[PDB]
Design a protein around this ligand. Structure first.
Ligand SMILES: *[C@](O)(C(=O)NC1CC1)[C@H](C[C@@H]1CCCNC1=O)NC(=O)[C@H](CC1CCCCC1)NC(=O)c1cc2ccccc2o1
Ligand SMILES: *[C@](O)(C(=O)NC1CC1)[C@H](C[C@@H]1CCCNC1=O)NC(=O)[C@H](CC1CCCCC1)NC(=O)c1cc2ccccc2o1
Lengths: 302, 302
């Protein structure tokens, strides 16, 4: 028993991290078979970071302008191309540590692990959720660009995120591995800012179920509610609408605990309307929304 | 910027996890050079788990009673011995993935990463702190025994924890890698329970500094306090006494923020006496105590 924000084991991804240098700009890349993926803004200079024309900037580069360092080994760049906001550097050596992998794009409200890296060297691993406004509440310092986010299923690494920038509120923005940004963000310095965010209702309910599975029951009640009355409350508190598909997804947890999904909704309504009256749930005084139903099932006993 | 509970990258430890089976009991072991370390209660039966004499139980075993599986490879056991509450199985193959390593024992209030494993297969990584009462608030299911806790410095893995059991309150107990239990716990079924716990004051103050570094300043004030008046408050709220050595350890963070340690103490006193009045700090509505000054410095900008 116990419930923690848990990341996937990072070994498979650690084997793929490298350092990419162009000019005086150094950041991280992801080495898979004979290709290194990295943010295209490695080719920028502090002189054209405001409105860069990346096609122009790239045309003025050649293979030898890119230095790729894997551990203490120089990888020779033998081709280069852009795909959306990522650069693909073809290298003359296939990474012998390449895992089975996939490039997936994730949905807001889904979670993934982030391997924070600096100069091609991993420093830490943590769990994140893609917020409804397509940002992530990460932990990223200068040098972290190129760090990736991923999930692991069986032997297979599904890469879902590459890190590009930090917004004025301290939250983070990046792309999928095809170089397409999550959200209405661009890789150029502008006044761009996070849009308004909302709470991921289905995840809060999953976490309430985790709490019950782990013996926190003080917020339960004999009441129930309909989906529509619940969603009237959800709207009032800036929670996302709960759909019937969410109810269905919560089915396993509902059956394991014997607490019907709409009964849990009655509990969440009471918590929203009354607060916690000084109590905690799984060690938190706030309602947590970064655990999916899958995260809860994977971590919690059967 | 950003602040997250971050674990060390787990790759180096993943390379050392194996499965150990004795009879119908299967758990995890840690393979380093030609030795596998695991909890000695792998030799117990549900028949003698109440008051086992491990010396007797071990004497009745031979090398062939232990099945060690590394991935899909059987490791031949060629010797066996007990050291306190851990078993050392000498195997005929040195682990080629052995990292530079050390066996350290940690202090209450220090943090470490846990690699949760089942059947020798890592499933997740997370950050923990050793509580003042020598327990850890982990996430461990049946099958997790033998999972380890560690820190990484440069290339060197300092193993500090092996997992043995769960206590009635849902918290966890284990040993260092020499098999000596953390706390007044024993590897036999008794009524044993966690003793009273306290909050790690120096870590709360480190986390307040992290909050300032990350732009949360609402809890600051123009006041100050002496160490003794602060500790009178600390005692009242079941916080650990703050020593001058703790003040010294907080020096870097104090200098980086320009907020004297005793001024931060004045802030913590106000938060203890008044609560948070509906506000949060680094996304928490509770005062967090599982980040050491080192964790904050390592993660936060310079
Ligand atoms: C990465 O480019 C990076 O790590 N580069 C390596 C070479 C050093 C950074 C990562 C940032 C750094 C700041 C702290 N957290 C973080 O995640 N990304 C940027 O610096 C990004 C770069 C621009 C350049 C054109 C393409 C993409 C954006 N810029 C910002 O994050 C950013 C935030 C502010 C705030 C105020 C003024 C400017 C600014 O830029
Ligand atoms: C490990 O032994 C383990 O994983 N063994 C592998 C072979 C299956 C478990 C880990 C526990 C399991 C329960 C849930 N969380 C967790 O961390 N450890 C135990 O089961 C431990 C074993 C005894 C045996 C003698 C030596 C050490 C203790 N027992 C307990 O954790 C425990 C908790 C309770 C509560 C009520 C009755 C009994 C009990 O046992």
């Amino acid at each position: 028993s116990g419930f923690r924000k848990m990341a996937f084991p990072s070994g498979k991804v650690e084997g793929c991290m490298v350092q990419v240098t162009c000019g005086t700009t150094t950041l991280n890349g992801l080495w898979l078979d004979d290709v290194v993926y990295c943010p295209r803004h490695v080719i920028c200079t502090s002189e054209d970071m405001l409105n860069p024309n990346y096609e122009d900037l790239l045309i003025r580069k050649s293979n030898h302008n890119f230095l790729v360092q894997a551990g203490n080994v120089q990888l020779r760049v033998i081709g280069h191309s852009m795909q959306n906001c990522v650069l693909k550097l073809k290298v003359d050596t296939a990474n012998p540590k390449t895992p089975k992998y996939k490039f997936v794009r994730i949905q807001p409200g889904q979670t993934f692990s982030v391997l924070a890296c600096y100069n091609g060297s991993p420093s830490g691993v943590y769990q994140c959720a893609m917020r409804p406004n397509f940002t992530i509440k990460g932990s990223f310092l200068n040098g972290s660009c190129g760090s990736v986010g991923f999930n692991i299923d069986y032997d297979c690494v599904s890469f879902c995120y590459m890190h590009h920038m930090e917004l004025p509120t301290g939250v983070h923005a990046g792309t999928d591995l095809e170089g397409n940004f999550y959200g209405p963000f661009v890789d150029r310095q502008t006044a761009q800012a996070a849009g308004t965010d909302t709470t991921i209702t289905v995840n809060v309910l999953a976490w309430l179920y985790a709490a019950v599975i782990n013996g926190d029951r003080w917020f339960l009640n004999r009441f129930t509610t309909t989906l529509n009355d619940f969603n009237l409350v959800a709207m009032k508190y800036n929670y996302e609408p709960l759909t019937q598909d969410h109810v269905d997804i919560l089915g396993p947890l509902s059956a394991q605990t014997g607490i019907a999904v709409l009964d849990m909704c009655a509990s969440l309504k009471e918590l929203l309307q009354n607060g916690m009256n000084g109590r905690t749930i799984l060690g938190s005084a706030l309602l947590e929304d970064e655990f999916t139903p899958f995260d809860v099932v994977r971590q919690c006993s059967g």
